[PDB]
Amino acid sequence: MSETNTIFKLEGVSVLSPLRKKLDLVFYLSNVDGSPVITLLKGNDRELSIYQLNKNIKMASFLPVPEKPNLIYLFMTYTSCEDNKFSEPVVMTLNKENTLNQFKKLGLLDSNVTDFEKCVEYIRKQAILTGFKISNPFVINSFHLQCHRGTKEGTLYFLPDHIIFGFKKPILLFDASDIESITYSSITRLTFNASLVTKDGEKYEFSMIDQTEYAKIDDYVKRKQMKDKSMSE
Template sequence: MSESFLNHLPEELRGRVVKITSVLPNSLSIFQDVYNFALDEVLESKRKQVKSSTSINGKHGEQDKVEESDIILKLDNVSVLSPLRRKLSLALHLSSTTKKPVLSLLKEDHSIEFSITDLKSSINMASFLPVPEKQGIMYLFVSYKQSNNPKYTEPLLITLNKESTLQQFVNLGIVSSDEKDFKKCVDYLRKQAIITGFRINDPFASESNAFHVDCHRSTKEGVLYFLSDHIIFGFRKPILLFNSSDIESITYSSITRLTFNVTLITKTNEKYEFSMIDQNEYGKIDEYAKKREVIDKSMSDELKAKKMNQSHNEGQSALKEASEQIEVNINNIPMDSDDENDENFEGESELSDGSDDSDEDSGEGSEAEEVVDEQQEEGEEKEEEGKFSIPHNDAIKQEIPVDVKKEMKDLHENSPDVVPADFEDIPIEIDEDDDSGVEYD
């Protein structure tokens, strides 16, 4: 025995033990006891690790099977939507080790895919819920603290086909063969849950005030369930579950003729907005909030200030945009130089030499043309200097035809107010008795 013990020691350590035992021969048995104790501790530690890895709460739990004799109730081929999506069997059964009730999802060979142990303390709430617009299907919703597999954290959601579930209850002899009321199945399931340590609510029974509304959460379409103690949004991941007592306040916004939005604000100041709710649902939601003394902050000073700031910012933005547009339009107006429009100013400026030619009257066309030519030349010289002087219109009179002159004179004789066509001076008669004080030359 001692030889075997020494052979398992490293050479250097074995030499030290041999040296001590050569001086104290009785010490060899002590070393043997120490070796055996250490060996037993190592083996026990390895056994615990193996047991932990194969327990129902570990990775190997998926390979554990439920014995037929341990099954309390099993529904085959139910549609599981969360925390995984698969056709599995729902079972209430006893644990093979603790003999305590367990809620599990089983594969065809009765191996466990998902399970919840310690049902009384692990399940937060469970409820039957209607499926909107599908009378033949019902949801079973279960919120729990933890499962056998850490990767499953979403609530358990199962759809029960009423017809097939009722038929299974008939086959199990739980209800009579002529039974058509699915409520019998619901009542039986609720009783079995109570026996195993938890409660399944049925809030949408005829006497209940629970209701649900269609809505959107961001781009996800879903259903908002208002229960007596909870509010659930589902059933696109992530599924949201609120305790009614945790809702601090509510606001209504984006109100139109057809729809409105609801924002739930928790006591930890988390905000969850649900949009596109039908206007017909407002009364029920508002009554639900008032009964639970939830504060309506739709008209709060904080929200008003926020809306006013938004309106102010929108107004400032509109003014800024208009200002920028005006600036762009002004900048796009062509700013022509004076030399491009000098012809438009002819007849409004004085002669280039500063004299006024209004007293000189040229009746000859050739003389007028010479004056214009000279003034154009002088104007071009001034143009180079940045100044303009265009001759008066009187210096560019044109010869009026004789027949036109005669017609205008005849018109003047009949109508003295009409000026003659040749612009000749018209004698003005002065009333000698006029004592207005105005002198005439």
């Protein structure tokens, strides 16, 4: 852990999960085997560390923050933490503008750059060069919608191969191929409810879904159940 082997560092990223804190993200290669590593720091003391990303990273994706065009989620599922401290998805919020200014001040992007996505394809490039991959599904036309689970609101990210529920513990991650059924209920003037039944039989009820979001949801489930019908062969 030194400045030389450090790829890029981001100060002021807002970590929501596992713990909620404004920390500094660091992406670098270990001096032992040159394997990639992610670290969340508070000053110089490390709050979190995911080692051997190329191996331990199960999933990684950029997910838009609803109604906040200048903020973007980084979402990551992993196997083992630093001494197995946490075991839940790392979710954080990068400020687009700030991330741009930092990368340019670091010389990672030319001072001429003004588009934030360039910052993304750079990160995604760094993942690829080390062993793992970070997706960017929002650029099946991936979509997301607000809805309630119980009494608390949350986002629903319908991605090409996964469905996420947005970021209030517990966070939900469905393999698209794990959906066995979907039932619609509580139809109202403006909304409806949808309960997903998985293969193992778990039922999850999502509420207050805008009726507009139905078509995208059903079709999404049909196309998945469809492809699946052929994967049995």
